[PDB]
Design a protein around this ligand. Structure first.
Ligand SMILES: NC(=O)C1=CN([C@@H]2O[C@H](COP(=O)(O)OP(=O)(O)OC[C@H]3O[C@@H](n4cnc5c(N)ncnc54)[C@H](OP(=O)(O)O)[C@@H]3O)[C@@H](O)[C@H]2O)C=CC1
Ligand SMILES: CCCCCCCCCCCCCC(=O)SCCNC(=O)CCNC(=O)[C@@H](O)C(C)(C)COP(=O)(O)O
Ligand code: SF4
Ligand code: SF4
Ligand code: SF4
Ligand code: SF4
Lengths: 94, 145, 364, 340, 44, 112, 176, 112, 96, 118, 208, 48
């Protein structure tokens, strides 16, 4: 969560009010509600799982409590397979 | 079709192919209709897309790391029945029901291709071809699209 | 127009709560329109939901599952208990009693808790939908309903003790609001308004809808067509609803709560997350909705306030072309002027109470 | 820097492009100014020194988010900087007809406006509108108008391109000018210095003043110009008060009072800890005839035709009528004699 | 094994649904007698 | 003699058979004026004659009510009066005549 | 099939006449009603000591909307917009763009808590369980604008109530 | 075509004149009862303006329906069904003037 | 409840009924808030064979209304339906 | 010469300044379905939409922005537009021209229609 | 068997068809078409002139005793020349059956009031006049119900926008609630939901 | 918790006198209840 030149806290979307913008007045004696937790950083932090099969399935964890089950091809050595929903990454060993 | 699935086995997955900066490819969604190959051969004239392999492992796309470059390449996005081939610039931006469709004419060229300008909340979201058998059959150039 | 306190002319002005519900329904899919019917009659939400569901199912040519039907009948009778509690207690409060209101509204709170447990909304739940009911009863709800029903009779008896035989209450209602049976029929009156006058008509028996053919209850009929007789009819109807609730509790069937057709009723969450066809159908049902075969139907139920009807015309799309709601209160408020003739202002208040008008229904 | 393109059809939801800080918006003129700003779609920032309850009436005036209330102190410059930081326009309407222990005429009409103008110039606000009585002059008997003239000089000093609007008595429903004369019925006869024959006044309708201010904000030429706001007709005080009582259908009993006696009475009412009914300054300002300043531009320059007092008097003075005359039409009372 | 909210085996107990307004009080003759006796004692 | 019909506004008729006979005879008289080939006359006469024969045959009010299946006999007399009024208005309306006008081309087409 | 309310005839025997006369003159029935009120006076009151005591609620309660996350911390939303589509009041505004990672995430997610009807849809509709009406009901505000929620506000609510929301979803996930 | 109330334009004009008379006499009573601050002349001018707005109608049925709507509005005003807000809505006081010249529309916005 | 015996007697006598037996306020009789996980049954169409949707497609079995009579190209009198049968007084409680 | 403009209640600006387009909606090229190309549609001219200052939601002042009407035939839509006194522009229906399709042509001996890949 | 699909009752279908033919024969002057829906509902289509005669026939026992007007409403289909379809729903308690009679009208063509026949059509016809633009002749009192006292347009007419043309707010300047042109802060988002593929082949209209 | 008391009064919470830098000795509110105890207090769960 970086801070913009005006002193506002830039959101995860990247939204920050420019010095020219008059809409910054809305926070004059109030606060701008920004979620400190950023999805991109946390998803990056997760370790990459290494699986020995060409295709693996991600349900998001918790079965029916997660996301629709999808099968990911891991043939490409260069790039890890990434779940469309979960965002977790997998790659074949070696 | 039926409203339920009797398929109790694991599904197949296909490694995605990169065919350019305009068409986003998720080949696991491909249904091997071969529309893209026939379009590229017949209309575009570029015989670079084809089927490699046999059986359930049959895959559609350049065997090599070739890029499908043509004026009419974007039309494969429209032709593809499934979302295997999708517009990279338009990816994730909007859903079909939201968009308001306005029928208009392109100005990039003098062909006068008829187009549908899709706008949501006052913002242009995409340009889609409109059928005029005389001027543009169902296709538009990459610059128009 | 009052000469003294005698009402020479009573002219009802409505539309103070007209929210354009019918126009808005045309812009919504059938599922999206379902919450509207909860709001039409705030006191009897689930019955209106059932009426809409019956209309949509008849147009769809699909049949709700049996357990769904029994759940619908049970919660409809609970809604009738709520509606009659509200009507009788608010009528007494307007005529000045003011204690049975609190007494019975405690039980109304308990029935609201049943609503919340099933749906998560104390009132205005979307539980009853075309094709069945959204979710199966939470485990333990039926025994709790039994606990409530076993004791509710004492509360109704105490209310009768307060009001039934009181000289003051009988004076305020004994011969006010008399309506002839032929006048009641012509003016479009339904429910207790007809039955108070002595006409024997209850759609639950004459034209059963969901499972009322399989339950036993007695239609209370009145003899004098007065406010007092209608109050007696409503109390006896509450007791008969308790009888029906016991019957529904004992004979609840096992099985599915929504039609096993994924092109009308959404698939189960696990199936949608595990099966491609289920995911496709969930996506389409929650974005486009289910197309209804073109047609028109007038489906009516014996709602707690009378006959509730929906004239639904379908153009074959996912959104209804026209939806006309027949509110029982409309004709009763129309006949209020005829009923008020020859009475005073307090009699007019009592007559307004007798016809159990919720103006969300009247104005729509 | 803080420039917004206007968008919309001028409705509640539209964006006028006007971001304004209306000082003293919790008052007779502030209400109408804020209403006119909000209807266009402008963003209105209201500095309030009173309880939030008193500002509640202004809450419905604007669409969601348009009206922002920020507490401010006249003595503290930092609050002025906070309020005026993001505004492209600032309107100063801070004025009390009665002096108070904490704030005298000097502070309200000189110090406050000067601080506002200086902080606005520092902040970068494009436009500033300041209000000073038409009768304002450094040699006037009333301290109110004297401080008004000094404040006008100081504001012009701090903000060279500032529009200064000099309005006459502004008659309106919440006015303290027509209500002041009507309220004199409770005390029996209407005390008038010289019976009001020697005094001539040119009242202005409140809506006209607010529309003039808004048009001045809209008008590019208004910068660095002093406008005089005056009504269509000039009246003798006797005729005007008689017309007030006639429209109120209350008996008129004019009795001449010596100036010193009226000043003593004004001193008596000044004693009240709460809002004084009348002050010696009030008596002096009432007696003082409205100045005629042909040089200054007026409402006609801004495009608004002044509404005559006759048309709008019934609005202000109907409430003072008794039950017998509450329903009487406006036309029953003929227009008062005009000294024009 | 299926587990839905179902009625207890054998069903629920019977639920009372009819008016039970009780019969209470002395006979009219007795109440009048008591009132008259009180009146007479008060008079004496 | 039933104390009450049970429906408010409807009073027990002391002479039900006589009233029903008179009403049915009047209905037949009105029907006679209507053209012979009019369906209204044929059907209404068929219904009336059956009702009048039933009324004459049965001397007991309860048995007659069971046979007629029209509810309580007072309701039957009320329906007879309604029929008489209809027959009288029918004569003026002359519904038996051909259709006044065919609808526009697609006035009853749905879906549109 | 049908029952007769009223339709009872009083007995004319001297004892019954005397009883009814006593009721009229001696006000027996009003006394019975008075006794009922007194009995209620001596019964325990039903009032709960709010705020200290809170009324019962079930896991299926529909309250303040919330945006949930995966256990990793990634937001569950995949910008399906089907939850926007099913909203009966059109209270949800969603805009999305491919994020730097390349994932389908929502740049804008707004629920107008003033146009919402708290139907409970989009909790059933949303495929990934991202949007959930949580347990909170005491979110009254002093301004209208506070009730126009933003993606940041919804995510903050999800973080605040995740402990309760997860338990309730666990309780009711099998019924769904 | 079936006439609503008038078979020809002259009859509809007669009905329109009757309605205008009714409004013209009602205007002062409206100003008195609703405690409106407009003058009687102002209200009668507004009545004329409302009548003149539909002066282009050339079809008798449209004129008859307009007279019906005007009679309903007059009934509302004669009673107090309409409030001062409803009566003063005819005078669009709150709405700002909208320029009709081409240049002003060009300056203000994109509207045609 | 927690009422003393004297108050219970007073309330019961005033009511004319035994209030203790049926108490409006709810006690340990209510169902436990936490319940064992459910296992909801599947419906009739959850089969792996002979389940083709064409057989069970209700909507596609709807048909446009049948036209009995159209203007644009003895017999016994008939009624809309057989006349309704009179209701029978309830056995449990014919008169309330 | 039917005119319901006075009776409709529409304000004059929308009656006079609005152009209504009568057309058969073109098929969405993304899909091969043609069911949504079988009925004429009447749609009003687009007007300004601006962003709300508070939330950025698209605001409009055009009452008829979302108004779309379906007509079985072009003449009916024209009649409705004339009766309501809206200026109308009619775009003639576009129908796919008949095509000649041969699977055998894919394997022609001498023509260029032979397909390199199947 | 076939649990999902709704059970069909042919007996009621035959009875309703027979009674529809009965009505068509008795009143050929007004009835144009009678059809029985496959959910067992009977509709008789009548010329606009026949509302009073056909309704009076239905109420009075020519083997039909529909003495209750369930509801009266109109459906605005702009395509048709007579854009309004007046619908009457009647209930016969003697025969426990319901039938529907439908007629058409234009904006300029009056339709006779049925207050004489039924007396519950006063408010229903007033609502039809208020929302739709139909005028019922000889009505005892035709005025607005469910709309504002000064409302100008006729809603429910498929031309009227859902949000309308005017909006109400309180104005401090005039100390009054004042109408103004509608200006939505969030324009209603029109969703095109119809699928390009036909769902019901049974109702496929002829290609023409 | 007092299980003897009737349902709705068996569980109650005594709000803290100081929370998040606010004096709540007199001013208490429902939102002060943390989410984990919210379900216990509102009877959504029987387990504290
Ligand atoms: N006829 C007229 O109205 C004329 C107008 N003017 C000037 O224009 C303005 C018109 O206001 P008017 O209609 O009289 O209504 P007010 O007297 O209510 O105007 C004063 C406004 O400023 C605020 N205010 C007053 N004193 C102070 C202070 N010491 N510090 C900070 N804020 C203060 C008041 O809020 P609060 O109550 O909270 O203090 C109120 O909003 C005044 O400035 C006046 O001098 C000039 C000539 C004639
Ligand atoms: C307080 C003020 C409120 C006043 C409101 C009064 C109303 O509602 S006006 C409604 C009445 N409208 C009409 O009568 C429409 C008349 N239409 C016509 O076409 C006719 O006037 C004709 C045919 C032009 C003839 O008129 P002329 O004599 O030519 O002119
Ligand atoms: S058009 Fe799409 S589905 Fe067909 S072969 Fe090409 S990628 Fe696969
Ligand atoms: S929506 Fe269609 S294209 Fe997209 S994944 Fe599903 S089946 Fe494939
Ligand atoms: S479930 Fe919620 S967050 Fe996820 S795509 Fe749907 S609306 Fe967006
Ligand atoms: S629960 Fe709220 S967000 Fe979800 S559909 Fe209902 S109103 Fe919209």
């Amino acid at each position: 969560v970086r801070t913009s030149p005006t002193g506002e806290k830039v959101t995860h979307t990247g939204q920050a009010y420019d010095d020219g913008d008059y809409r910054r007045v809305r926070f004059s004696d109030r606060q701008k509600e920004v979620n400190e937790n950023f999805a991109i950083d946390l998803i990056a932090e997760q370790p990459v799982s290494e699986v020995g099969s060409r295709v693996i399935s991600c349900d998001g964890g918790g079965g029916a409590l997660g996301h629709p089950r999808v099968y990911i091809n891991l043939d490409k050595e260069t790039k890890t397979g990434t779940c469309g929903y979960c965002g977790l990454q997998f790659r074949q060993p070696h | 079709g039926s409203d339920r699935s009797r398929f109790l086995e694991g599904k197949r997955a296909v490694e995605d192919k990169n065919i350019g900066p305009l068409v986003k490819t998720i080949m696991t969604r491909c249904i091997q209709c071969t529309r893209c190959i026939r379009f590229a051969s017949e209309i575009a004239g570029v015989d670079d897309l084809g089927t490699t392999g046999r059986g359930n492992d049959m895959q559609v796309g350049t065997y090599i790391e070739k890029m499908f470059m043509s004026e009419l390449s974007g039309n494969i996005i429209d032709i593809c029945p499934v979302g295997a081939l999708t517009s990279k610039p338009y990816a994730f931006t909007a859903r079909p029901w939201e968009t308001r469709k306005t029928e208009s004419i392109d100005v990039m060229d003098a062909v006068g291709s008829n187009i549908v300008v899709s706008t949501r909340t006052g913002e242009v979201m995409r340009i889609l071809p409109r059928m005029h058998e005389d001027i543009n059959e169902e296709w538009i150039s990459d610059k128009t699209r | 127009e009052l000469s003294g306190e005698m009402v020479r002319k009573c002219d009802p002005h409505i539309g103070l709560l007209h929210r354009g519900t019918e126009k808005l329904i045309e812009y919504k899919t059938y599922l999206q329109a379902l919450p509207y019917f909860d709001r039409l009659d705030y006191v009897s939400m689930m019955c209106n939901e059932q009426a809409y569901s019956l209309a949509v199912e008849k147009l769809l040519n699909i049949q709700p599952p049996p357990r769904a039907q029994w759940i619908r009948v049970l919660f409809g009778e609970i809604t009738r208990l709520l509606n009659h509690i509200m009507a009788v207690t608010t009528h007494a409060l307007d005529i000045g009693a003011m204690t049975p209101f609190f007494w019975m509204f405690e039980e109304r709170e308990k029935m609201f808790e049943f609503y919340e447990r099933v749906s998560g909304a104390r009132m205005h739940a979307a539980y009853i939908r075309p094709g069945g009911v959204h979710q199966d009863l939470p485990l333990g709800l039926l025994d709790d309903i039994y606990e409530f029903s076993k004791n509710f009779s004492f509360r109704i008896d105490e209310l009768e003790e307060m009001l039934t035989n009181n000289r003051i209450w009988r004076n305020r209602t004994v011969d006010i609001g008399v309506v002839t049976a032929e006048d009641a029929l012509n003016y479009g009156f339904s429910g207790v308004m007809l039955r108070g006058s002595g006409i024997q008509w209850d759609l639950r028996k004459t034209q059963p809808y969901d499972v009322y053919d399989q339950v036993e209850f007695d239609v209370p009929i009145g003899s004098r067509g007065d406010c007092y007789d209608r109050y007696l009819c409503r109390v006896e109807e509450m007791r008969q609803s308790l009888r029906i609730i016991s019957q529904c509790l004992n004979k609840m069937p096992p099985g599915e709560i929504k039609v096993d057709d994924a092109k009308v009723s959404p698939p189960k969450r696990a199936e949608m997350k595990t099966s491609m066809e289920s995911l496709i159908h969930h996506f389409k049902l929650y974005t486009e909705g289910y197309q209804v075969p073109p047609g028109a139907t007038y489906t009516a139920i014996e709602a707690p306030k009378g006959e509730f009807g929906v004239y639904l015309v379908s153009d074959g799309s996912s959104r209804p072309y026209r939806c006309k709601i027949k509110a029982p209160g409309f004709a009763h408020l129309a006949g209020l002027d005829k009923m008020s003739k020859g009475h005073m202002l307090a009699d007019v208040v009592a007559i307004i109470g007798t016809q159990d008008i919720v103006f969300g229904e009247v104005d729509r | 820097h803080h420039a917004l393109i206007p968008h919309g059809k001028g409705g509640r939801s539209s964006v006028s492009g006007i971001v304004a800080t209306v000082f003293g918006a919790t008052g007779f003129l502030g209400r109408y100014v804020v209403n006119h700003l909000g209807r266009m779609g402008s963003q209105v920032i209201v500095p309030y020194r009173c309880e939030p309850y008193d500002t509640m009436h202004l809450r419905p005036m604007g669409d969601l988010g348009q009206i922002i209330f920020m507490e401010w102190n006249g003595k503290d410059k930092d609050s002025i900087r906070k309020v005026v930081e993001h505004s492209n326009v600032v309107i100063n309407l801070v004025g009390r007809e009665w002096e108070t222990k904490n704030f005298d005429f000097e502070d309200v009409f000189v110090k406050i406006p000067h601080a506002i103008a200086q902080v606005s110039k520092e902040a970068g606000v494009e436009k500033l509108i300041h209000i000073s009585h038409l009768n304002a002059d450094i040699k006037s008997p009333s301290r109110y108008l004297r401080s008004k003239a000094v404040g006008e000089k100081e504001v012009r000093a701090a903000f060279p391109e500032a529009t200064i609007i000099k309005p006459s008595d502004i008659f309106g429903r919440e006015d303290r000018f027509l209500n002041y004369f009507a309220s004199m019925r409770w005390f029996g006869g209407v005390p008038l210095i010289s019976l009001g024959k020697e005094t001539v006044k040119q009242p202005v309708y409140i809506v006209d003043v607010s529309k003039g201010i808004i048009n001045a904000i809209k008008d590019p030429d208004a910068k660095g110009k002093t406008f005089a706001f005056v009504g269509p007709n000039r009246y003798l005080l006797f005729d005007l008060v008689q017309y007030i009582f006639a429209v109120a259908y209350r008996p008129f009993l004019p009795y001449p009072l010596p100036h010193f006696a009226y000043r003593w009475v004004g001193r008596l009412f000044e004693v009240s800890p709460f809002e004084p009914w009348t002050t010696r300054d009030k008596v002096e300002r009432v007696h003082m005839s409205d100045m005629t300043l042909p040089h200054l531009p007026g409402l006609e320059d801004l495009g608004i035709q002044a509404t005559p007092l006759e048309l709008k008097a019934i609005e202000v003075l109907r409430r003072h009528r008794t039950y017998r005359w509450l329903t009487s039409e406006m036309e029953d009372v003929k227009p008062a004699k005009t000294v024009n | 094994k299926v587990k839905q909210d179902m009625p207890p085996p054998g069903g629920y107990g019977p639920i009372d649904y009819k008016r039970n307004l009780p019969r209470r009080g002395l006979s009219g003759y007795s109440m009048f007698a008591v009132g008259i006796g009180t009146l007479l004692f008060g008079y004496w | 003699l039933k104390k009450t019909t049970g429906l408010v506004g409807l009073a027990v008729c002391e002479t039900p058979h006589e009233r029903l006979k008179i009403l049915y005879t009047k209905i037949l008289d009105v029907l006679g004026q209507i053209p012979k080939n009019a369906a209204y006359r044929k059907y209404t006469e068929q219904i009336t004659n059956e009702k009048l024969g039933m009324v004459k045959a049965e001397p007991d009010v309860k048995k007659l009510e069971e046979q007629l299946q029209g509810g309580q006999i007072e309701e039957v007399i009320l329906q007879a009066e309604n029929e008489l009024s209809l027959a009288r208005k029918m004569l003026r309306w002359k519904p038996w005549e051909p259709l006044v006008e065919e609808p526009p081309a697609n006035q009853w087409k749905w879906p549109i | 099939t049908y029952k007769f309310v009223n339709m009872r005839e009083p007995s004319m025997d001297m004892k019954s006449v005397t009883d009814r006369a006593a009721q009229t003159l001696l006000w027996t029935e009003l006394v019975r009603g008075l006794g009922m009120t007194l009995s209620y006076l001596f019964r325990e009151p039903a009032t709960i000591n709010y705020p200290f005591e809170k009324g019962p609620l079930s896991p299926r309660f529909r309250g303040e909307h919330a945006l949930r996350r995966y256990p990793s911390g990634e937001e569950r939303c995949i910008a399906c917009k089907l939850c926007e589509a099913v909203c009966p009041a059109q209270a949800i505004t969603i805009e999305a763009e491919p994020r730097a990672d390349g994932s389908r995430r929502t740049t804008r997610y707004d629920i107008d808590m003033t146009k919402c009807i708290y139907c409970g849809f989009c909790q059933e509709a949303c495929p990934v369980d991202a949007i959930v009406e949580g347990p909170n009901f005491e979110f009254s505000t002093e301004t209208h604008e506070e009730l126009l929620y933003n993606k940041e506000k919804l995510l903050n609510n999800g973080d605040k109530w995740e402990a309760e929301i997860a338990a309730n979803i666990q309780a009711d996930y099998l019924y769904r | 075509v079936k006439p609503i109330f008038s078979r020809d334009m002259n009859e509809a004009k007669r009905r329109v004149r009757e309605l205008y008379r009714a409004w013209y006499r009602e205007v002062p009573n409206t100003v008195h009862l609703f405690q409106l601050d407009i003058s009687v002349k102002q209200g009668r001018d507004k009545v004329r303006e409302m009548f003149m707005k539909n002066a282009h109608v050339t079809d008798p049925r449209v004129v008859d329906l307009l007279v019906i709507k005007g009679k309903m509005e007059l009934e509302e005003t004669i009673n107090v069904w309409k409030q001062r807000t409803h009566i003063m809505r005819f005078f669009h006081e709150t709405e700002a003037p909208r320029p009709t010249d081409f240049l002003s529309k060009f300056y203000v916005g994109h509207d045609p | 409840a927690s009422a003393t015996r004297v108050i219970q007697l007073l309330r019961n006598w005033a009511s004319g009924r035994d209030l203790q037996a049926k108490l409006q306020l709810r006690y340990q009789e209510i169902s436990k808030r936490t319940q064992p996980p459910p296992k909801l049954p599947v419906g009739p169409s959850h089969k792996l064979s002979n389940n083709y949707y064409c057989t069970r497609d209700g909507r596609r079995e709807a048909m446009p209304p049948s036209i009995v009579m159209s203007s644009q190209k003895e017999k016994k009198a008939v009624t809309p339906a057989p006349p309704i049968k009179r209701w029978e007084l309830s056995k449990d409680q014919p008169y309330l | 010469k039917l005119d319901i403009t006075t009776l409709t209640g529409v304000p004059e600006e929308h009656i006079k300044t609005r152009k209504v387009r009568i057309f058969v909606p073109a098929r969405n090229n993304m899909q091969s379905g043609v069911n949504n190309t079988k009925k004429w549609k009447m749609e009003f001219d687009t007007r300004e939409r601006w962003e709300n200052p508070l939330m950025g939601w698209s605001s409009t002042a055009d009452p008829l922005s979302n108004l779309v009407l379906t007509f079985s035939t072009k003449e009916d839509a024209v009649a409705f537009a004339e009766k309501n006194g809206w200026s109308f522009d009619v775009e003639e229906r576009k129908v796919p021209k008949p095509k000649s399709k041969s699977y055998g042509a894919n394997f022609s001996w001498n023509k260029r229609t032979r397909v390199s890949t199947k | 068997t076939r649990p999902t699909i709704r059970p069909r009752n042919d007996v009621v279908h035959k009875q309703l068809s027979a009674f529809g033919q009965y009505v068509a024969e008795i009143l050929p002057k007004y009835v144009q078409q009678v059809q029985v829906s496959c959910f067992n509902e009977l509709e008789i289509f009548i010329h606009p002139d026949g509302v009073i005669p056909v309704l009076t026939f239905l109420r009075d026992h020519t083997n039909a005793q529909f003495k209750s007007l369930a509801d009266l409403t109109a459906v605005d289909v702009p395509t048709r020349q007579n854009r309004f379809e007046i619908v009457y729903n009647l209930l016969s308690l003697r025969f426990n059956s319901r039938i529907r009679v439908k007629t058409y009208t234009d904006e300029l063509t009056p339709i006779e009031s049925s207050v004489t026949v039924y007396k519950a059509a006063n408010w229903y016809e007033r609502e039809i006049w208020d929302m739709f633009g139909v005028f019922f002749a000889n009505h005892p009192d035709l005025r607005r119900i469910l709309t504002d006292y000064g409302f100008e347009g006729h809603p429910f007419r498929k031309d009227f926008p859902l949000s309308g043309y005017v909006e109400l707010r309180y104005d401090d300047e005039v100390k009054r609630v004042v109408a103004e042109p509608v200006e939505l802060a969030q324009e209603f988002r029109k969703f095109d939901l119809n699928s390009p593929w036909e769902a019901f082949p049974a109702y496929r209209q002829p290609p023409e | 918790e007092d299980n003897k008391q009737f349902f709705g009064r068996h569980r109650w919470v005594i709000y803290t006198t100081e929370m998040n830098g606010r004096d709540t000795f007199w001013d208490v509110d429902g939102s002060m209840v943390p989410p984990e105890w919210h379900r216990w207090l509102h009877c959504m769960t029987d387990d504290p």
